[PDB]
Paper text:
Particularly, antibodies targeted the region between the conserved central helix and vestigial esterase domain of the HA head, termed the medial junction. As a polyclonal response to the medial junction epitope was not observed by EMPEM at week 0, we expect that the pAbs binding at this epitope were boosted by H2 vaccination. In an H2-naive participant, we observed recall of H1-reactive medial junction cavity pAbs upon first exposure to H2. Additionally, it was able to neutralize pre- and post-2009 H1N1 pandemic strains. These results suggest that H2 vaccination can induce memory B cells generated by H1N1 exposure that recall antibodies to the cross-reactive medial junction cavity in H2. Overall, these studies identify an unappreciated neutralizing epitope on the medial junction of HA, which, following H2 vaccination, is targeted by antibodies with potential for broad reactivity and neutralization. All maps were of sufficient quality to build atomic models of HA bound to Fab except in the case of H2’s cleavage site, which had heterogeneous density and was omitted from H2 models.
[name] viruses are categorized by their surface glycoproteins including [name] (HA), which binds sialic acid receptors on the surface of a host cell and mediates fusion of the virus with the host endosomal membrane. While only the H1N1 and H3N2 [name] subtypes currently circulate in humans, the [name] influenza virus poses a distinct risk. A recent phase 1 clinical trial investigating a ferritin nanoparticle vaccine displaying H2 [name] (HA) in H2-naive and H2-exposed adults enabled us to perform comprehensive structural and biochemical characterization of immune memory on the breadth and diversity of the polyclonal serum antibody response elicited. The molecular details of cross-reactive and strain-specific monoclonal antibodies (mAbs) isolated from H2-F-vaccinated individuals were revealed by high-resolution cryoelectron microscopy (cryo-EM).
Numbering used by the authors:
A (entry chain B): 244 to 262, 262a, 263 to 324, 335 to 445
B (entry chain L), G (entry chain F): 1 to 107
C (entry chain B): 11 to 54, 54A, 55 to 82, 82A, 83 to 92, 92A, 93 to 94
D (entry chain H), F (entry chain D): 1 to 35, 35A, 35B, 36 to 82, 82A, 82B, 82C, 83 to 100, ...
E (entry chain A): 395 to 445
H (entry chain C): 345 to 394
The structure:
């Protein structure tokens, strides 16, 4: 109910909400191009299959977690150390596994993988990668918020919160990658031994 | 308690079509919406729980999403087999309630 | 003759860091960080954004005279607004 | 693995008591820590929740039946039962028993019904 | 722990919720990760001790 | 390692088209995922940004030149080029090409220009 | 777009003196300010990026800091070699802009 | 006996005994430890903040 004795700017139209799903407001000076995406940041669209990205903190879509990092790489393989065993380095010839045997004999030599050992280690490594990446939980979220100029205390609280969680997750992501790469390489050296 | 409004009351769609069915809660039910598929002669089967998670064994053509007070069931690539009443269940409070049931016919 | 136990070696140049060692070459690694974007603003899930361009949210909803192209209100996948919009 | 089976009199006369029993198989009724539910469908009408019992005797009901309903379980037989007094034509329905499972979530356990029995029809007539 | 917000405080309610969900994810992550890292080391510890 | 080198006609007459080419060396133009920029200095005046191109064809420009400027790259030769139509006395400047790198940050990638070429002078006269 | 105001327009200082040059943005540029040193006859060299980080190879006498809308370049222990115009660059938006350039003379 | 490293040898012989560090092993371990400390402390990020 509207009532006025003056100074009223009345609506002519109202806006019915017809669809209420999640979206968000993105701040950018670019324009729409004739392309498609499942995840969009202010700097451009991303086509991803990995758990983390370093493009921008804000995004609209089903996206990887943002970290403040240039590099997160998980070793899955062996230290690539280029007639001699693990002491010297890797026999170049083997492509059928990770760990294996030379088998020299009088019928003829030839390298072959140890399938039992490689397969157990292989599943160990794939389970490890999955434990590392499946623990990241993201969701569609309109992350950005706007505050007025009289809400500096709240804006700063919000920013601190977001920066705080970014530091925690960047730390956890980098630390986990480094701790796991150390163990991955020890794991592989242990398995050859 | 919290009432559930389900709409459309009925749908008609061809094989290969994509359709949507929605749930509207009278109150905030915070990601506690479950969707069920009831074929004639059978007890309802759970399709989606906790707004968007599929139950094991549920075909990938089913999906859904939502937030406080508003949720959607999306069924893509409809097959002749996807004939059922679909129901909205609100698990948020103790006196658990259901919507009316949407009847989806396949051509 | 002898049987030797060894491991794979490759021509991979991919390197990783560990807590106590840095710049270590490995045969395989999984890069788990996405470092690229295409530089374009696209249609999210096949549905275009609302393109306000020069218009602000208040401009759009109130009907700024220069935002007369937004009166058609199509479905949005996201709202695209310039930082510090004019209209 | 988990199945729920139901039985009852089939026919109940007006003003009599309706009594149904659900037998739980493959899921210990007293150990799971899950809630056991009763649900029904009247002809034409959709699903109506009746009530539930915890693995212990804590029981809750749909308030519309507060003057007529009782729910109980016997741990010894893995059985649930439903009792409705002053039964009338409105109580004709397919009755179902179901198990309530959960997902830990941001708002607390998020409950859903995975296992349902086949149900049974109770007719109320003279 | 619980707080209530008015219908004109959606930005704050969402901030509060995000904070709580954020800490829950951090602690759930830390709890699960610690259990898995420790179980791996516990089993290696025991095999190491027998050796 | 990374160097940028530039060349062009030197002299452009009024109302002609100015065209400059930057050759990127030690940095694959199409693989870095970096932005390539053009900047210029008119006599007396300070640095003015002209525009940039991504490793792909997405291109942005300084709005003051929107009626006159085009930027493009040829991946095959690691080259960038700048084209300005309707060139006048105001366009006399030292032109420079530069590479845009970044720091991941709390507000998103934080961009800066590390590698610059030597630049070249274009004189506009009759 | 976002304009940059740089001040002083010029400085004069002796060898061993410490001076400051500042940047003021018309808008919030959130730690996206870069500083450049331009010696006559050369393309500008990056000194400071992301408000306070020195570029590799930049002498330790250079430093700076700042926050939304206000940043400072500090040059301590000025040497005869630190003769240059210094520029403010705002990397926050797409239509990237620069300040006027401060001309610092060394005695 | 030792101060020239962490890991080392006794070397008893007929000319005379005397401990000595294994420089290859200690140096690799040493760099391992200093890298470890740096990975632990360089990951802490603080800033001037009111
Ligand atoms: C993502 O990349 C794959 C190729 O790896 C392509 O088939 C798919 O269409 C791309 N997705 C989008 C949205 O462009
Ligand atoms: C890693 O090693 C290569 C030589 O194999 C070297 O060229 C490169 O600079 C090293 N990287 C770092 C960060 O030291």
């Amino acid at each position: 109910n509207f009532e006025s004795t003056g100074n009223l700017i009345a609506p002519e139209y109202g806006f019915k909400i017809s669809k209420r799903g999640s979206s968000g407001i993105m701040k950018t000076e670019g324009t729409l191009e004739n392309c498609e995406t499942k995840c969009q940041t202010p700097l451009g669209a991303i086509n991803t299959t990995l758990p983390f990205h370093n493009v921008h903190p804000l995004t609209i879509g089903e996206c990887p977690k943002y970290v403040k990092s240039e590099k997160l790489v998980l070793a899955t393989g062996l230290r690539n150390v280029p007639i001699a065993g693990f002491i010297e380095g890797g026999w170049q010839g083997m492509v059928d596994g990770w760990y294996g045997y030379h088998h020299s004999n009088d019928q003829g030599s030839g390298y072959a993988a140890d399938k039992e050992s490689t397969q157990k280690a292989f599943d160990g490594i794939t389970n490890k990668v999955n434990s590392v990446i499946e623990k990241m939980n993201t969701q569609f979220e309109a992350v950005g918020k706007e505050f007025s100029n009289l809400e500096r205390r709240l804006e700063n609280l919000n920013k601190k919160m977001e920066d705080g969680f970014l530091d925690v997750w960047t730390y956890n992501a980098e630390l986990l990658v480094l701790m796991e790469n150390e163990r991955t390489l020890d794991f592989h050296d242990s398995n050859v031994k | 308690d919290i009432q559930m409004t389900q709409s459309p009351s009925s749908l008609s769609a061809s094989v290969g079509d994509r359709v949507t069915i929605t749930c509207r809660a009278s109150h905030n039910i915070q990601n506690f919406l479950n969707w069920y598929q009831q074929k004639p002669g059978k007890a309802p089967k759970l399709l989606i729980y906790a707004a968007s998670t599929l139950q094991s064994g549920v075909p990938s053509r089913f999906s859904g999403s939502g937030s406080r007070t508003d949720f959607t069931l999306t069924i893509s690539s409809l097959q002749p087999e996807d004939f059922a009443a679909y129901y909205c269940q609100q698990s948020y409070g103790l006196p658990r309630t259901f919507g009316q049931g949407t009847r989806l016919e396949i051509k | 003759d002898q049987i030797c136990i060894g491991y794979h070696a490759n021509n991979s140049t991919e390197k990783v860091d560990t807590i106590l060692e840095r710049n270590v070459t490995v045969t395989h690694a999984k890069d788990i960080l996405e470092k690229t974007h295409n530089g374009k603003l696209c249609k999210l899930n096949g549905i275009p954004p609302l393109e306000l361009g020069d218009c602000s949210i208040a401009g759009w909803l109130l009907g700024n005279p220069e935002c007369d192209r937004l009166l058609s209100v199509p479905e949005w996948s996201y709202i695209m607004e310039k930082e510090n919009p004019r209209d | 693995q988990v199945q729920l089976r139901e039985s009852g009199p089939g026919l109940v006369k007006p003003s009599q008591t309706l009594s149904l029993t659900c037998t739980v198989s493959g899921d210990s009724i007293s150990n799971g820590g899950l809630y056991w539910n009763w649900i029904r469908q009247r002809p034409g009408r959709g699903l109506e929740w009746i009530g539930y019992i915890y693995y212990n005797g804590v029981t809750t009901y749909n308030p519309s039946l507060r003057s007529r309903i009782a729910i109980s379980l016997e741990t010894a037989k893995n059985q649930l039962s439903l009792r409705l007094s002053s039964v009338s034509a409105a109580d004709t329905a397919i009755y179902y028993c179901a198990r309530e499972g959960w997902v830990p979530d941001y708002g607390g356990r998020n409950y859903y019904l995975d296992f349902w029995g086949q149900g049974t029809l109770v007719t109320v007539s003279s």
